[PDB]
Amino acid sequence: AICSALPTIPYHKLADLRYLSRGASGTVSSARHADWRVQVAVKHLHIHTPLLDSERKDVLREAEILHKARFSYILPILGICNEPEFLGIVTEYMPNGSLNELLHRKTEYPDVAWPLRFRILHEIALGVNYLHNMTPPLLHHNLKTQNILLDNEFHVKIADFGLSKWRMMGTIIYMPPENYEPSIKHDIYSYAVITWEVLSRKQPFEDVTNPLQIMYSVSQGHRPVINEESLPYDIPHRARMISLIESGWAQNPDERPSFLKCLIELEPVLRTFE
Amino acid sequence: AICSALPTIPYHKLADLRYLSRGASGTVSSARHADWRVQVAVKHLHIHTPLLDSERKDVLREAEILHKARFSYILPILGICNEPEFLGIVTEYMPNGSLNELLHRKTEYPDVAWPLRFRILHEIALGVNYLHNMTPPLLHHNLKTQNILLDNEFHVKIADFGLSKWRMGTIIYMPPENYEPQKSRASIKHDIYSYAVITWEVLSRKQPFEDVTNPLQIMYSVSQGHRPVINEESLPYDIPHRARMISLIESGWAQNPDERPSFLKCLIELEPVLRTFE
């Protein structure tokens, strides 16, 4: 009965474009919206190179996903900018950037308190759980700490639905081994690696330089290192968390939980926080 | 081209219903969503009395408005619960309640800092401005401090679209031209009047027309040009940009609607004031 069209934003409504990130297909700029008087983010194709029709349908697809999948912990899409010269997804601006910045810029963030870390982990879980509970389920398939955005008060917004799929009935460190040996449980594997990354503040497979070596190692059952040096003894519920992580990134996909099951399992741990 | 249906929530997915507010047509309960594992709010019709078909179309209309009008400072609707027994709008839960609670519970909140007050005022303005910039424009027509919800970190969410209209209860927030029934373009400048009263209320932490007991007396007074009191007692000298704010308030609640700004104009005017904050 009830539906809503995604707003179309005229190009002239976007002012003060400044580069935030530039990639292969995806470039992100910050902007002022002239009507709304707020700062926005614009994920757009390169303004210099010609805009191909296959690249055009990709962006409209990603925009449709974001618009359908809106929820407290998913990046809110504000509208689409669809012009002959320009194509861009307009989203809310995230002042604190991506999660990896918080975890790995140790000068800027000397102490990242345990309650915040666990809250971040809980919110990522809640976000992906929502996606998996849509009809049909939406699988993210690109969860990275680089893709978890943080708003003004450090709440999670899941971003980058470029590789996302409807269950129809780049770095490889977050990818389950069955994706490359010569996937329904993909997101939970990534989540386990992210959990490890959040609790350690370390790059997974830091010491391994060749990505093919990581791939062979992972396919043989090697995982990011768990000891006292990587995961310190003072982590709250360290035993549960290690247990959960290791089930989350299990070699056999059947041993890995659903996000519902993962949230059930996490709630004993989160009950002890403020 | 691109559109999204509002999710339909089966009744059994809502657990642990607890009353948050009960009114004439609108009752609000908090709940657990069994799938999503989050606390939600449910704005529903009374579960005891029979659900009339005119009351049913009212709730579906309000839900359609919320779903179309989603934005950073508007209450997010998560879905609709549409059953034979039960009808409810499921929204995000707001832990800090309504704005009036922050302003008027002075034991619970002894000091409410100026930067927070101005941020609240800025966000209300941004919210209503968004509504007015939709096509067609959406006019709220029920702005009260009682209707401005505050999330976990005290950010604004505009709520209660029960009296809202597409362009093309207390009376203290109502412009005098609205008192009596041809209908004109003065119905466009309703929200800005309410905003001016809210601004006064935020800066003073006082009930507008506290000293006037009969609401009809308020109405007569307002129609003759009387407004909430501006002096040192109500609006203290230590308000940042006190002169600008008084000037803005008084233009916002002007007797002639043509003297009142659009929310775009209001945001333009506010940005000199907000530039001096963190």
Residue numbers in the entry:
A (entry chain A): 5 to 173, 188 to 200, 207 to 298
B (entry chain B): 5 to 172, 188 to 200, 202 to 298
Authors' account:
Upon ligand recognition, NOD receptors oligomerise and recruit an adaptor protein, Receptor Interacting protein kinase 2 (RIP2), through interactions of their respective CARD domains. RIP2 also contains an N-terminal dual-specificity ser/tyr kinase domain (RIP2K), which belongs to the TKL kinase family (Tyrosine kinase-like).
We successfully crystallised and solved the structures of all three RIP2K samples: the structure of wild-type RIP2K with bound the ATP analogue AMPPCP (β,γ-methylene-adenosine 5′-triphosphate) (RIP2K-AMPPCP), the structure of RIP2KD146N within Staurosporine bound (RIP2KD146N -STAU) and the structure of RIP2KK47R. Crystals of RIP2KD146N have been obtained in the apo state and with AMP-PCP or the promiscuous inhibitor staurosporine bound, without significant differences in the resulting structures. The best crystals diffracted to 2.8 Å resolution and were obtained with staurosporine. Each monomer has an inhibitor molecule bound in the active site, whose configuration presents all the features of a kinase in the active state. Differently from the ligand in the RIP2K-AMPPCP structure, staurosporine is coordinated by Gln150 backbone, while Gln150 sidechain is hydrogen bonded to the Tyr192 phenyl ring in the AS. The AS is close to the loop containing the site of ubiquitination Lys209 (residues 200–210, referred to here as the Lys209 loop), which is also disordered. In agreement with the crystal structure, the data show that RIP2KD146N is a dimer. In support of this, AUC analyses show that RIP2KK47R has a tendency to form tetramers and RIP2KD146N structure show an active dimer without phosphorylation at AS.
